[PDB]
Design an enzyme around this catalytic site. Structure first.
Site, PDB file in Angstrom:
ATOM      1  N   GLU A   1      -4.743  10.142  -0.198  1.00 43.13           N
ATOM      2  CA  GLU A   1      -4.886   8.811   0.383  1.00 43.13           C
ATOM      3  C   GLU A   1      -4.179   7.749  -0.536  1.00 43.13           C
ATOM      4  O   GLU A   1      -4.285   7.798  -1.745  1.00 43.13           O
ATOM      5  CB  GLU A   1      -6.414   8.550   0.310  1.00 43.13           C
ATOM      6  CG  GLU A   1      -6.803   7.145   0.630  1.00 43.13           C
ATOM      7  CD  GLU A   1      -8.281   6.859   0.375  1.00 43.13           C
ATOM      8  OE1 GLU A   1      -9.119   7.743   0.108  1.00 43.13           O
ATOM      9  OE2 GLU A   1      -8.584   5.681   0.485  1.00 43.13           O
TER      10      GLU A   1
ATOM     11  N   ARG B   1      -9.501  -3.412  -1.329  1.00 48.97           N
ATOM     12  CA  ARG B   1      -8.448  -2.543  -0.785  1.00 48.97           C
ATOM     13  C   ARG B   1      -8.299  -2.625   0.695  1.00 48.97           C
ATOM     14  O   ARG B   1      -7.358  -2.135   1.293  1.00 48.97           O
ATOM     15  CB  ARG B   1      -8.753  -1.043  -1.148  1.00 48.97           C
ATOM     16  CG  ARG B   1      -8.420  -0.752  -2.560  1.00 48.97           C
ATOM     17  CD  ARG B   1      -8.751   0.688  -2.940  1.00 48.97           C
ATOM     18  NE  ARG B   1      -7.867   1.630  -2.296  1.00 48.97           N
ATOM     19  CZ  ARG B   1      -8.194   2.833  -1.831  1.00 48.97           C
ATOM     20  NH1 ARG B   1      -9.432   3.337  -1.869  1.00 48.97           N
ATOM     21  NH2 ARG B   1      -7.208   3.532  -1.324  1.00 48.97           N
TER      22      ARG B   1
ATOM     23  N   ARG C   1      -4.549   2.412   5.333  1.00 51.21           N
ATOM     24  CA  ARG C   1      -4.183   3.474   4.340  1.00 51.21           C
ATOM     25  C   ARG C   1      -3.119   4.348   4.974  1.00 51.21           C
ATOM     26  O   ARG C   1      -2.846   4.368   6.176  1.00 51.21           O
ATOM     27  CB  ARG C   1      -5.388   4.428   4.219  1.00 51.21           C
ATOM     28  CG  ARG C   1      -6.696   3.901   3.680  1.00 51.21           C
ATOM     29  CD  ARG C   1      -6.628   3.524   2.215  1.00 51.21           C
ATOM     30  NE  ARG C   1      -7.952   3.102   1.757  1.00 51.21           N
ATOM     31  CZ  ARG C   1      -8.413   1.835   1.885  1.00 51.21           C
ATOM     32  NH1 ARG C   1      -7.696   0.861   2.377  1.00 51.21           N
ATOM     33  NH2 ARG C   1      -9.632   1.587   1.411  1.00 51.21           N
TER      34      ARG C   1
ATOM     35  N   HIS D   1      -9.794   2.131   8.550  1.00 49.87           N
ATOM     36  CA  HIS D   1     -10.563   2.772   7.581  1.00 49.87           C
ATOM     37  C   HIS D   1     -11.032   4.162   8.093  1.00 49.87           C
ATOM     38  O   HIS D   1     -12.161   4.553   7.891  1.00 49.87           O
ATOM     39  CB  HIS D   1     -11.761   1.960   7.056  1.00 49.87           C
ATOM     40  CG  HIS D   1     -12.273   2.471   5.758  1.00 49.87           C
ATOM     41  ND1 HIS D   1     -13.198   3.506   5.687  1.00 49.87           N
ATOM     42  CD2 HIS D   1     -12.048   2.109   4.476  1.00 49.87           C
ATOM     43  CE1 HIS D   1     -13.493   3.750   4.418  1.00 49.87           C
ATOM     44  NE2 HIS D   1     -12.818   2.911   3.646  1.00 49.87           N
TER      45      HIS D   1
END
Length: 96
Positions: free
Chosen positions: A54, A65, A69, A85
């Site tokens: 990740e 963050r 991703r 997420h």
């Protein structure tokens, strides 16, 4: 399951930055970047432990963050974007 394929040019520009950092092996902005992604919920295809990693996609303005991703798979060109997420994923097409 994977929701479909998305051109890299249609993703936020920060996803292009994260893919360039993965190609150079960093350096990365967050200490969590590069950790193994367990795929505990089996949303992506089942693979051995460590097959997936990740990396953060920065969200402009965020203190944390955030929820964006890139997950790499070990196969050539296998990279997934999530903007929620890990609830949903799309395969990135770097050719377009």
């Amino acid at each position: 399951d994977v929701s479909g394929t998305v051109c890299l040019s249609a993703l936020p520009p920060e996803a292009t930055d994260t893919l360039n950092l993965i190609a150079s092996d960093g350096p990365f902005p967050y200490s969590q970047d590069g950790v193994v992604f367990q795929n505990r919920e089996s949303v992506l295809p089942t693979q051995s432990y460590g097959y997936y990693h990740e990396y953060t996609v920065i969200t402009p303005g965020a203190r944390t963050r955030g929820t964006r991703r890139i997950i790499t798979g070990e196969a050539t060109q296998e990279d997934y974007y999530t903007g929620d997420h890990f609830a949903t994923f799309s395969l990135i097409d770097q050719t377009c």
